[PDB]
């Protein structure tokens, strides 16, 4: 009944939204979570994850991975990553292994089960999938936030996640595991507006006071309306796939340096002739959406 | 009215644009020049000149480049059939294509003119390119290109590439990195001008020559259209330049810094279109983002009623 | 005699040709186009008249391409300082070189070849242009390229740096090619001693020599003179047929000529390829010519 | 003299196995580990074949397993050279040893990181297990004495015209080495080519003998053929070994500074060393680059070492 999951990220803000749904919701086993430089650098990212976490009683190890991408110049986004909340100190440490390493061995020790979820830079998963290419069939699927058939946010032709390490996604998207691309297409629509932050300051705790304190920085939201929480439809897709259309489709990562740099082809109208390699983000449900997250934020409240 | 040289492949829509330019009073058609692409250049000079001998419409034609500056050559046969024209039957040829090479056309008209002149390339932009490079002179006095080809968004022929554009990326780097003032009428436009069984039985009640003409092209590319991209009906895409140059108010766009990728792979021959600004370049393209299929529907009755004898 | 169209983008060595071409009884040089390289059309064109000029050469010159096909153009730097001309009295032809070139091998009996020593921009456009001259050339011999080190980059070398794409083109018309990349013309070192003999030697055609080679001393290459040695005798310079790719990827080796001197792709040779020049022989060669000019 | 500690990364292979028999045993060599990656055959392959050399040798070194695949591109092998099992020639007696249970990458970090920077990598198979502990952990960067590595040419390449195996195998993980900023040396075929090891050399070691002696016959015998069948060479040449002899004598070989770049696009130069020979592009060298070898040198120190083993 419930999908077990390793949470994949690099907080990030609303990183920190797909940790507070994926850790509460009883319709998902959150085994663990690593994390992988992207939005920032790596010892920005976990301190950040372990923030949340401890902020929010989360009783799931932590293990960090990946500092650097696989082979490019690193890039960042845009002074933690995570402005807006306040933490108290931290307490909350990583766990010694690897992230990489605890991916495999979990993969390895699995019954098939796990899904993974992506919603960083794809730097682990191609170096777990290259170390121990074994873990290809234990692994049921892999939900990732990441790429755009249409327009890009870093460039025109490529979303973050994608560009900050190209060949890594080029490893994920050639590896044949079924995947799910939550694409910019899709997430662009899933609009956080005043009302939705009103909504959750109301049911209030410590997940209500969180989402609104991120949100309510992040929008700016005493002035002008609203903008995007990326990375948490990826959970929602797990909950219920019902409240999101996707679309089958060839996609392939273009690895060349020049303008579609990281760019994810997706072969809409199938003029390729190639089976199908992805479940593609088309439309949200925002209704829906906006509930499960309210739903997931009263199930922190004491 | 805006003088005119169309460049193209004729090619079904290719027929449309040149119906609509050789009789709009907007327009002053001054030549034809004719390119390899949607078939071989025997074939669409063939097809031009029909057009060209059934509608009477005296412009000279030239015909151009027979190959892509670089690239191994590719058709659109899969659309627009074996002839390149399939649908109506002409009668015998009398006409000919003129002696001058259309790219040479292109450079002494441009050299000799006032800088008033706008280039409309409808097909793969080779005979374009080939003129700029050899004669760089004629790029100040080009007053707009006006193009159909590439796509933002989902391409045909590729899923990132629209097939002028794909069939000379080369050529279309030239274009797209000229200086030249540039609007650029892609699938994300075009496609909306599809051309249902209603809109064909309009025409037909205009009637003559060009009401005919225009019902034996389009229901070819019904089905076409719809098994290769799963169009409604054939947009009618190079027609939508001709309509910008009549009225642009009926076409809304978009100023954007375009580049063409060059790379061999998956995204040989996209028009990269930079939709949010996010490279802070200057924009060098006037991108189409939406048609009033209202106002161009009747534009076309317009100049289909023009060849009513 | 071979029938030729010497293309070039003159361009110190490039004049060293045209005196070759224009004077062995071996060779029947019907024209010279000219493209830009070296330094911009416009210097290129007017160099080529004025070494035509000075030694009363009576062939017709066709201005060619003053760009690359696609890329942004690139120079290597009036182009040709050395020798001292009077004011320019000859002109260029008002056909474009392209279109001479076209007509020229249409009209012909298939039995011209093409001898291009600067970038490759007018053979290409000809070559897309009319696709139907490729039957009708019997041979390009070409100086281009390198199957080892580059000069212009590591990769690259100058001719086929200045249009890769025009060079992509060429290299897979299919019609028989012959490379003089620099790994043969590097070899072909002009010292004090062969410009000294050239002196002596005497006349027009000696003194320009002796101009050039002194100059871009400051021994060095005669490179694009050893397409016209190669047609006079080809048994002067020993070849290898290879397949030859043309790499158009921007990057590292963006205009290289890729070589497959092991024969490891399996594919057919579509070039010979130079390898090593008898010294002995080719200044001799150059000699004779120089003294085609004394009067 | 002082020792060179070295940590010996290969993808054994027949000359990878001459290397393991001279860094094993010379004095001026300190062989800390051997780790293995995926190259000349499948890991499961070269693994068993490590394993069998030092079986062999008796040389007691821990073995680490490492990369079974490159970072990013379609794997490939050296079967055409190398045979079906990676080292085909020699008879080997079951295994009585085996891999150590930490991953190679894992213990070139944690070696590097407990060092007093000192230690030398030689990489002599495809750079997959460098390149995943270089951006694994960073810190491992300026730990590095130098990297004296196998791969590569500044002229013709083996696989293809532009790219020699090694570097072609994983070109992005060759990148990353590249691009490292840590001393470079490279023994790229224009240099190893010239120690082909023709029917002479062989009986030169058999002459020697003992146990280094009649495995070198073994091993090189195999070779001989498919050099000379793929690649017209006049014998196999033992081109990991001379970053061993690199090693322990430099003057043996002359190099030339170079900046050198990784090309890493789709298409003819995929995989290729572009090595800036006479400096045009204007930027700081990167690579000591190999120009020739001093063969008299080179063999009387193989000998040497195959001695090194009589009982
Ligand atoms: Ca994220
Ligand atoms: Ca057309
Ligand atoms: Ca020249
Ligand atoms: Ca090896």
Same mark, same amino acid.
């Given at each position: 009944?419930?999908?077990?999951?390793?949470?994949?990220?690099?907080?990030?803000?609303?990183?920190?939204?797909?940790?507070?749904?994926?850790?509460?919701?009883?319709?998902?086993?959150?085994?663990?979570?690593?994390?992988?430089?992207? #939005?920032?650098?790596?010892?920005?990212?976990?301190?950040?994850?372990?923030?949340?976490?401890?902020?929010?009683?989360?009783?799931?190890?932590?293990?960090?991975?990946?500092?650097?991408?696989?082979?490019?110049?690193?890039?960042?986004?845009?002074?933690?990553?995570?402005?807006?909340?306040?933490?108290?100190?931290?307490?909350?440490?990583?766990?010694?292994?690897?992230?990489?390493?605890?991916?495999?061995?979990?993969?390895?020790?699995?019954?098939?089960?796990?899904?993974?979820?992506?919603?960083?830079?794809?730097?682990?998963?191609?170096?777990?999938?290259?170390?121990?290419?074994?873990? =290809?069939?234990?692994?049921?699927?892999?939900?990732?936030?990441?790429?755009?058939?249409?327009?890009?946010?870093?460039?025109?032709?490529?979303?973050?996640?994608?560009?900050?390490?190209?060949?890594?996604?080029?490893?994920?998207?050639?590896?044949?595991?079924? =995947?799910?691309?939550? $694409?910019?297409? =899709?997430?662009?629509?899933?609009?956080?507006?005043?009302?939705?932050?009103?909504?959750?300051?109301?049911?209030? $705790?410590?997940?209500?006071? =969180?989402?609104?304190?991120?949100?309510?920085?992040?929008?700016?939201?005493?002035?002008?309306?609203?903008?995007?929480?990326?990375?948490?439809?990826?959970?929602?897709?797990?909950?219920?796939?019902?409240?999101?259309?996707?679309?089958?489709?060839?996609?392939?990562?273009?690895? #060349?340096?020049?303008?579609?740099?990281?760019?994810?082809?997706?072969?809409?109208?199938?003029?390729?002739?190639?089976?199908?390699?992805?479940?593609? $983000?088309?439309?949200?449900?925002?209704?829906?959406?906006? $509930?499960?997250?309210?739903?997931?934020?009263?199930?922190?409240?004491?």
């Amino acid at each position: 009944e419930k999908r077990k999951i390793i949470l994949d990220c690099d907080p990030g803000h609303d990183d920190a939204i797909a940790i507070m749904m994926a850790a509460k919701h009883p319709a998902i086993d959150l085994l663990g979570i690593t994390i992988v430089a992207g #939005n920032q650098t790596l010892d920005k990212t976990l301190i950040n994850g372990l923030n949340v976490c401890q902020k929010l009683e989360i009783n799931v190890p932590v293990y960090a991975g990946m500092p650097q991408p696989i082979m490019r110049q690193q890039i960042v986004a845009d002074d933690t990553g995570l402005d807006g909340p306040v933490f108290e100190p931290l307490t909350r440490q990583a766990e010694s292994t690897h992230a990489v390493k605890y991916i495999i061995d979990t993969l390895m020790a699995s019954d098939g089960d796990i899904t993974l979820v992506p919603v960083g830079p794809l730097s682990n998963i191609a170096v777990a999938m290259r170390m121990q290419p074994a873990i =290809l069939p234990k692994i049921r699927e892999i939900v990732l936030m990441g790429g755009a058939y249409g327009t890009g946010n870093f460039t025109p032709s490529a979303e973050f996640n994608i560009f900050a390490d190209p060949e890594a996604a080029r490893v994920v998207f050639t590896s044949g595991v079924p =995947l799910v691309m939550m $694409g910019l297409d =899709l997430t662009n629509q899933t609009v956080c507006t005043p009302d939705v932050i009103a909504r959750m300051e109301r049911a209030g $705790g410590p997940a209500g006071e =969180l989402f609104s304190d991120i949100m309510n920085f992040t929008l700016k939201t005493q002035f002008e309306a609203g903008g995007p929480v990326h990375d948490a439809t990826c959970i929602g897709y797990l909950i219920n796939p019902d409240g999101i259309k996707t679309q089958e489709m060839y996609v392939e990562v273009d690895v #060349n340096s020049g303008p579609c740099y990281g760019r994810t082809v997706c072969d809409e109208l199938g003029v390729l002739g190639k089976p199908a390699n992805t479940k593609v $983000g088309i439309t949200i449900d925002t209704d829906w959406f906006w $509930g499960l997250v309210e739903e997931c934020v009263r199930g922190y409240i004491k």
